[PDB]
Amino acid sequence: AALVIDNGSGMCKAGFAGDDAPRAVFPSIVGRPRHQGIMVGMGQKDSYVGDEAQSKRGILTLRYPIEHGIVTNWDDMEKIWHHTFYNELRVAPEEHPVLLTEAPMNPKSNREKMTQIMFETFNVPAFYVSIQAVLSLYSSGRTTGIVLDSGDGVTHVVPIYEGFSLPHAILRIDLAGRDLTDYLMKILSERGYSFSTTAEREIVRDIKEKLCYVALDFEQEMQTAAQSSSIEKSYELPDGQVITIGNERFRAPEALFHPSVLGLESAGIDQTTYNSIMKCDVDVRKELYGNIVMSGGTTMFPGIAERMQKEITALAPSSMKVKIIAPPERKYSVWIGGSILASLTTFQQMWISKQEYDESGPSIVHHKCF
Amino acid sequence: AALVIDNGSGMCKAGFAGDDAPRAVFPSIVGRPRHQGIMVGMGQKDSYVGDEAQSKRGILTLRYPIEHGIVTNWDDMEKIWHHTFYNELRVAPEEHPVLLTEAPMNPKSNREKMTQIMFETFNVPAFYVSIQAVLSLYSSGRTTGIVLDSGDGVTHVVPIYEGFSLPHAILRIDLAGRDLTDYLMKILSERGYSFSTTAEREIVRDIKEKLCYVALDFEQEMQTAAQSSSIEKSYELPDGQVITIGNERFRAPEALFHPSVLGLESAGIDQTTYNSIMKCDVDVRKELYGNIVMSGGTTMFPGIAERMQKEITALAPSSMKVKIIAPPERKYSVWIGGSILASLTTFQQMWISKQEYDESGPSIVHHKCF
Amino acid sequence: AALVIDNGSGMCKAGFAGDDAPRAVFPSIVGRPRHQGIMVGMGQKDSYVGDEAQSKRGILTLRYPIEHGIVTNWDDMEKIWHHTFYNELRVAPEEHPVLLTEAPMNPKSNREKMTQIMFETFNVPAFYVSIQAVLSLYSSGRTTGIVLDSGDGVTHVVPIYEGFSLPHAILRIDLAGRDLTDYLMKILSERGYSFSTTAEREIVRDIKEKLCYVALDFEQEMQTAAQSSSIEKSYELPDGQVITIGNERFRAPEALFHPSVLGLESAGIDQTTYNSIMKCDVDVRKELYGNIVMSGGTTMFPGIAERMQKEITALAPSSMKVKIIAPPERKYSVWIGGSILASLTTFQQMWISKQEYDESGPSIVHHKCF
Amino acid sequence: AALVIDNGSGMCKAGFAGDDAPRAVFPSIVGRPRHQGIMVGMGQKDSYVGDEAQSKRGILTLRYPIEHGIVTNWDDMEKIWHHTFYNELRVAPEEHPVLLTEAPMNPKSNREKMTQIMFETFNVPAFYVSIQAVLSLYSSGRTTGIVLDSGDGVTHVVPIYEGFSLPHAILRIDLAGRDLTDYLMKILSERGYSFSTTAEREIVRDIKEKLCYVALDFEQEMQTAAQSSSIEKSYELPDGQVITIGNERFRAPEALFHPSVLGLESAGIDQTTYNSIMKCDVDVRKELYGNIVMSGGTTMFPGIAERMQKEITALAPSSMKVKIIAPPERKYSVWIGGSILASLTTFQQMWISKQEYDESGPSIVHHKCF
Amino acid sequence: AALVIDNGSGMCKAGFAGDDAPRAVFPSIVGRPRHQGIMVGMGQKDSYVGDEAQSKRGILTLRYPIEHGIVTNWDDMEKIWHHTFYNELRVAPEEHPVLLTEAPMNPKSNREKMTQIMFETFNVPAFYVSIQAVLSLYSSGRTTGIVLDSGDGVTHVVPIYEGFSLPHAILRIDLAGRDLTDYLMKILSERGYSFSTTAEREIVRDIKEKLCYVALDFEQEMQTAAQSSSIEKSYELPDGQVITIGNERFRAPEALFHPSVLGLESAGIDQTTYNSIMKCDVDVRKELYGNIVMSGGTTMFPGIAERMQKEITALAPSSMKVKIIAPPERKYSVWIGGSILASLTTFQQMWISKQEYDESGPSIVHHKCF
Numbered sequence A, B, C, D, E: 001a002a003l004v005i006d007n008g009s010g011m012c013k014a015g016f017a018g019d020d021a022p023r024a025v026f027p028s029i030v031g032r033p034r035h036q037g038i039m040v041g042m043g044q045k046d047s048y049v050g051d052e053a054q055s056k057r058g059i060l061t062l063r064y065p066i067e068h069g070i071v072t073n074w075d076d077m078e079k080i081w082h083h084t085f086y087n088e089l090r091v092a093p094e095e096h097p098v099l100l101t102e103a104p105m106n107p108k109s110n111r112e113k114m115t116q117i118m119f120e121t122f123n124v125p126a127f128y129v130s131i132q133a134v135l136s137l138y139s140s141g142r143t144t145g146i147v148l149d150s151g152d153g154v155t156h157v158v159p160i161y162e163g164f165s166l167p168h169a170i171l172r173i174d175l176a177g178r179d180l181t182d183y184l185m186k187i188l189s190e191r192g193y194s195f196s197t198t199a200e201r202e203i204v205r206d207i208k209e210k211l212c213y214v215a216l217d218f219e220q221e222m223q224t225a226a227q228s229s230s231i232e233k234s235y236e237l238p239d240g241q242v243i244t245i246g247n248e249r250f251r252a253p254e255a256l257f258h259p260s261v262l263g264l265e266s267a268g269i270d271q272t273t274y275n276s277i278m279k280c281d282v283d284v285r286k287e288l289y290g291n292i293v294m295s296g297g298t299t300m301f302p303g304i305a306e307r308m309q310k311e312i313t314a315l316a317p318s319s320m321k322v323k324i325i326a327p328p329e330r331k332y333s334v335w336i337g338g339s340i341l342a343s344l345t346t347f348q349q350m351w352i353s354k355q356e357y358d359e360s361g362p363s364i365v366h367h368k369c370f
């Protein structure tokens, strides 16, 4: 069989080909201790990975090796892969093909270096890399859709029509879960809660996951928060402090629809989606207003689908039906689709073999991968 | 029995001999995908034909293999025939004679190549090809008429008198449905609607079919459109956009009567018809002002017959009666007449047999076919 | 001196009396622009004449004011005369007698109107009009002949015997250069070359002039064209396209001998000539089988004389000699003869003077002119 | 005198009639600040125009009021005109006629609204609007040509023959400088350089202007870029970052010849030009393969002329000469020609006067302007 | 006139609007006696403020009511304001508008409570509060800059561009003068000097002010201190003890550039400044590397500017000029700028009036103040 690794910008997910769910999902982070090892009797490591780092954020600088889908630190990413199969899946990469995923329009050098590492370091027998949105559409089993994939680091919109690309109408924006988390720390300081540190960054991430929700109508929610306290429920920090969060619960997610709050000129997910559809030919807009496929954990916000419906129906022409496809598996939809793709026997001829790499080195990829 | 295929420049029509209506009518188009097959799991074809292409114009370059009655792309025309009987009618061409149709004064090489293909590729047992206008007159069951056949690609006028040709007074003009569609796109851009693409070309075709009508008096209609909005009704594009079309509804069809708007020097259908009649002998002009037979879908414009009446009565001498024969079956009148002709037992001796082709090859046709 | 103007149906030719060759020869055409004058800074005219029109056929409707020897458009013919002397010869018509020419059996009204215009508009001091064939026989200096004059618009046969008319045996047929050109466009479309327009009409005229030749034996030529490619040489259109012309080179001229290809019942030039001779008295047929005088540019076809010889010797009785007089000056033979006639001092008493016109108006001509 | 304003889709150009060069050339853009005015003591404006906006793109949403030659935002266009004469030229529009320019086949409503504004708002005494290509041909002083005008927003091909329009063979495509700039941002992200924002859009425009060149042979250039680094020179962003650009330098301009890279079906400039010429009559194709007139800043790419020569000579028939007229003044060729036209005394009768507007309102224009 | 009070986290500064220098500058501290009043005849107070407290630190718990820019003890802050105008300036707050200052991103509740107190307690007629960095930039009279304001309690970086905020790129860190003082006590204990108490805290503050300097190169200074004694000069405690301070003189200030010594993850002032600039748009980074404005007494360290230059030039791209604006008035630059702002007549419409407060209470401020 083959390995499937999404290389998630925020949470790496890996598992065997043909498996319906990923077996290893963990933060794609590394931890470099801040402090001296004065308890000499303790056995220690120079660095930690994933959950091991998450054990003890208070002593670590957490660093994400992927920023906005770009590998910024190959040294650490190597560890992430190494840990993923040698320690967590406990799999020999030398014995199984592995399929990776990358955001569209990503830097060509990043892809080359990725494959160079994977062949020369982990000595994979075969390799492939694919666009995440494609895979997430595989998971739906659809022929057509426009994939509003919004991972931790990147939100990218890909229209697809019965398996033909529409490369001229891809949209990509940097606005993603990480920017939302930074914004949340920025506003949540409004109440006094500091959260200066990268550890508190990792806590405010959890506050986002658990308490934030998408406002169906921002103004209405603001009004009712100005009048009603029922919105301003509460969360407990690891120290036991109890914090409360009112309008902030939905103000932050609202940024997805009004990025200008962050200073980003690019419009929200809804507007970008509409614009992308418009950039496609009139013929396909018929079907691409249907089959809007949400994907990624950034789409896991409660009420996101409803807001998308509202917005797009307002933007889209009259007499045009909108259908937001919002499966429950959104967090995994990419990995599942990669599993399906790798399982296809027809696809088995697509893998870049160690032979082809030896024939052509890291620049082979552009001739093979989609 | 024998097959009857009109080989329509815009919509191929085929069916069994003796059938009163064609069973397969479809656009004579092929589709070559513009884009990469990134959804590798989708089963796909290198090209599409007819309705299959029409499913998904947004991803295809639509190409008509017949331009102005000339086969410009034998590679695709072969597919059109192949699809017509092997896939749609689901008929063995090896077992049934097939009767084709061609515009008059057409290039001799096109006819030769046509028969060469049909004998050598599809191995038809017997073959014949006839002038479309003749067949359309058969469908009327008349002995005499002047056939103002106006297909998608060609408009050609043939006077016929009790089954004798009048080859000296045939007229042919390139002005046809396709030119009208191009003109419509040209003017309809006046309002902003772009329709640059071959897909939008295929939409504007439908706008023509559904909304355009022939002005009984162009100036009057222009005036009332300048004063009355009741003319400027509306159509819905596949994306759901709603467009409105005023004087353009009848300005475009008017080109049939004033081709100079397109820059073509040749006069309109009415003038050409009159001129052709005049080129016949005085004896037959008596009857050829009667029995004017409209044919082809280009003649399906509402009010066309009335305008023809008006114009010809104005051009024709006094005391001369004009009678525009305008059956409801105009779109099919050629194919129906071919069906009748093939059904005639007397005609069964006219077919060019596989024997005669083997005796004489592709140049046999000139000695046989009318 | 006097002006001599042949008023050629296809190429007007004019010059001074006593001159051995015409000084102005140009197409008898006018050009009415098809299109708007958007380049406002260009100085322009509402219409063009002759070579000025020929400069820019692509923007003009070329119209011949003379059809089959009948002035169909006096408005334009007036321009042709006006241009001829006021602009090209740069001669005052008010100061010089002018001699015109007309086909025999031509409409009496055309002759009346011609002289009415010439006296009332251009105020010529003196006027005469003569039959073209007569003049062409003058140019030969013969006393007897049968003149097979074949201009652009009309072919007319006049037997003449020592200066006595034989009005009972004149033959006239519409078959002429223009009909040949139309036929050539008709057949040459066989290969694909469209030539729909009046401009392409004027190009196909040149194709006729340069490549066509008369078949000594049509069947033999057809056979050898079916076997030999050496016939099918080639011509270059003004756009630079290169066309080839095989049997068409001689098929078209053959129409002169078998007009039935065009549907005209009247027999060919040879048959008509023979018939006319037969309609003369037995006495003169002795000499009229000799002194057959070719004339007009339609007779400029290579090998025409040989074919005439063959045909007439086959039709004519045995022991009868045939002699086709085929000078090199055929294109001009009418005008030259008119020059000679006008130069004759004896003829100076024949001119219709401005005095006689004032005495009797346009109907004087029938009492004077031959 | 009269004002001449090209109303450039990307750079408005204005100056006095009879001037050989425009005095005001500036981006046709407006700037709406993104951020609060916290430095209350600073005197500020609600919006900025042209160079004032360009001073400080980092705080502005740059918006072009003209998209593909269509005024999309009359509110801002009004400012552009207002600034042009009241602030930059410092001219009273109430006292000088002004001549505008518009792309051919443009929406009729846009032209009406344009003149309505100019008469009712700026109270011009006289007005005219003309097709840009015409003017650019004036600047050449030619009688004939085919104008491959390629502005920022629109590329449109107009054949012209001695001042007669050929409206039947105009071609227009949306592919222009702006699309090229978007494509450049799209590909240049290949290296990592983000350029998400409208400000970075305006920087990448400069990268295009300064570093891009047209490949004489795309494949050869690609090969040598794959082998040679000498192509991949470098540019400095305003922040001082230094970027390098290899094959991208010529890949982007190549889109002009292969728009399919952008997904546009319409062929390149060369193909469109050839097709347009072919759509003209055979007569004029002789001269329109000569006198191909380049125009617009999109044509300023180095080596564009050579590529055009190569392509057209390959497409055009043999024995046909091609002559790409490539003056150095291309950026201004429209405005200069408008200056010439307005200077013509003969043209002084063409202006639409405030009187005629009062007589007939905004719909007068269609009866007057070309 | 209006009062200007900076509400300095470490030294409150107050004076009249339009004054070039603050008239009252004093520690923002209160003193609560530790001990019984056994000398009953002495007249005494329950608490002391500012300099009165500083008279007799040995008997007082010094408490700063502002911690890291947050009012932690409203009871004492009220006294600070009360003393400031009723006792030191000897001004009626009921009669003069007062302008306060606050750090950016500060808790919204603190601002509300501030204005509530100032209106309800001191009954100010008018009120405004502004960001300190803005004011400090006013004092420079610049349109653009990035303000590295480092007060006693907070260091906060604000980029400003021609009076538009860049709220997305503000940085704030807790590292300030107070943390430096704590660190100094921590290290200076290395030599034996205890300084446990809040009084000795207030002495070590003076040691910092008088002896510490910023190392241009920490390693070099460490080396030379390891070799040279000339660094280790000396200070006299109030008791007359004489202490010496070597590498400690510059080790402590170095923390500003390497906060990790204190365990703070956030990078130094230089790194934060660079990062903030980077978070601004490329357009403005051109000018924000210039016009770096130092502010606050924490910036008064000798050689700080040089180190900033060095660091930023090393971090900033090549060919980018850096200009550290380091006026001599740094301690007062905020207050002076507030004076200027209040003096502006245009600003007089910005004050929140007692009327508006009565209309809207403490929550008015968010709608008014920047």
Ligand SMILES: Nc1ncnc2c1ncn2[C@@H]1O[C@H](COP(=O)(O)OP(=O)(O)O)[C@@H](O)[C@H]1O
Residues within 6 Å of the ligand: A006, A007, A008, A009, A010, A011, A012, A150, A151, A152, A153, A176, A177, A178, A208, A209, A210, A295, A296, A297, A298, A299, A300, A301, A330, A331, A332
């Ligand atoms: N409950 C949640 N609600 C909203 N966003 C979430 C939630 N859980 C995770 N995310 C966001 O999205 C990421 C996980 O989703 P995923 O789509 O798999 O992207 P990635 O694989 O790049 O992390 C996060 O790390 C976080 O920013």
Ligand SMILES: Nc1ncnc2c1ncn2[C@@H]1O[C@H](COP(=O)(O)OP(=O)(O)O)[C@@H](O)[C@H]1O
Residues within 6 Å of the ligand: B006, B007, B008, B009, B010, B011, B012, B150, B151, B152, B153, B176, B177, B178, B208, B209, B210, B295, B296, B297, B298, B299, B300, B301, B330, B331, B332
């Ligand atoms: N409702 C309609 N009104 C006018 N023209 C039509 C209509 N439907 C089809 N046509 C035109 O004529 C064609 C169909 O008619 P037909 O006479 O069978 O010719 P062909 O077989 O060459 O298409 C078209 O493809 C179109 O140009």
Ligand SMILES: Nc1ncnc2c1ncn2[C@@H]1O[C@H](COP(=O)(O)OP(=O)(O)O)[C@@H](O)[C@H]1O
Residues within 6 Å of the ligand: C006, C007, C008, C009, C010, C011, C012, C150, C151, C152, C153, C176, C177, C178, C208, C209, C210, C295, C296, C297, C298, C299, C300, C301, C330, C331, C332
């Ligand atoms: N080389 C040629 N070969 C055959 N026919 C020609 C040639 N040149 C001209 N003609 C034909 O005859 C005309 C010129 O000859 P001409 O006898 O003077 O008659 P007209 O004066 O009526 O034109 C033409 O315009 C053309 O139809």
Ligand SMILES: Nc1ncnc2c1ncn2[C@@H]1O[C@H](COP(=O)(O)OP(=O)(O)O)[C@@H](O)[C@H]1O
Residues within 6 Å of the ligand: D006, D007, D008, D009, D010, D011, D012, D150, D151, D152, D153, D176, D177, D178, D208, D209, D210, D295, D296, D297, D298, D299, D300, D301, D330, D331, D332
């Ligand atoms: N050096 C250059 N090379 C290529 N294209 C350019 C250059 N300078 C400007 N352009 C392009 O063309 C425009 C300027 O040329 P112009 O023909 O006057 O059209 P417009 O007036 O509509 O801007 C641009 O704004 C840009 O897209």
Ligand SMILES: Nc1ncnc2c1ncn2[C@@H]1O[C@H](COP(=O)(O)OP(=O)(O)O)[C@@H](O)[C@H]1O
Residues within 6 Å of the ligand: E006, E007, E008, E009, E010, E011, E012, E150, E151, E152, E153, E176, E177, E178, E208, E209, E210, E295, E296, E297, E298, E299, E300, E301, E330, E331, E332
């Ligand atoms: N000479 C000095 N060198 C370095 N820091 C100083 C000096 N004097 C005062 N400071 C520091 O900064 C403060 C005074 O500066 P200021 O910028 O006005 O901030 P604040 O108003 O919050 O005190 C102090 O109380 C102290 O931490």
Ligand SMILES: [Mg+2]
Residues within 6 Å of the ligand: A006, A007, A008, A009, A151, A334
């Ligand atoms: Mg993922």
Ligand SMILES: [Mg+2]
Residues within 6 Å of the ligand: B006, B007, B008, B009, B151, B334
């Ligand atoms: Mg048909």
Ligand SMILES: [Mg+2]
Residues within 6 Å of the ligand: C006, C007, C008, C009, C151, C334
């Ligand atoms: Mg003649």
Ligand SMILES: [Mg+2]
Residues within 6 Å of the ligand: D006, D007, D008, D009, D151, D334
């Ligand atoms: Mg321009």
Ligand SMILES: [Mg+2]
Residues within 6 Å of the ligand: E006, E007, E008, E009, E151, E334
């Ligand atoms: Mg301060």
